[PDB]
């Protein structure tokens, strides 16, 4: 079934977008592909430990990690902006 291939492809395509969006996944992809790790890349981590394996589960796990981190960051920042920290 070609249709069934579209369902797998569309899920995989969104998996790759998370890899190219989450900093802990962008850094890992650079190592195995022999790409330059810059201080910009190290700055995007914001202290988060870079991912070692690049499977689907790790991509999802890191995406969950990045979402909660960004949330806490926004919260603390807004607490400073509204003079609440």
Partner DNA sequence: TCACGCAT
Partner DNA sequence: ATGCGTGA
List residues binding DNA (CB under 7 A): 1, 3-5, 7-9, 11-12, 55-57
Q: Quick one: what does residue 9 bind among its own copies, DNA, none, with the CB cut-off 5 to 8 Å set by partner type?
A: DNA
Of residues 23 through 42, those in contact with its own copies by CB under 8 A are: none
Report the phi/psi class of residue 46: left, alpha or beta, with left for phi > 0 and alpha for psi in -120 to 50.
left
Cβ within 8 Å of residue 19, ≥6 positions away: 25, 26, 29, 54, 59
Q: Report the nearest approach of DNA to the CB of residue 22 (Å).
A: 15
Binds its own copies by CB under 8 A, chosen from 17, 31, 38, 49? 17
């Amino acid at each position: 079934n070609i249709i069934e291939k579209k369902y797998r492809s569309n899920i995989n395509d969104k998996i790759e977008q998370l890899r190219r969006t989450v900093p802990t996944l962008r850094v890992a992809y650079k190592k195995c592909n022999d790409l330059p790790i810059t201080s910009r890349d190290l700055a995007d981590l914001d202290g988060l430990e870079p991912a070692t394996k690049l499977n689907k589960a790790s991509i999802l796990t890191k995406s969950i990690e990045y979402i909660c981190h960004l949330e806490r960051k926004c919260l603390q920042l807004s607490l400073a902006n509204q003079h609440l920290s």
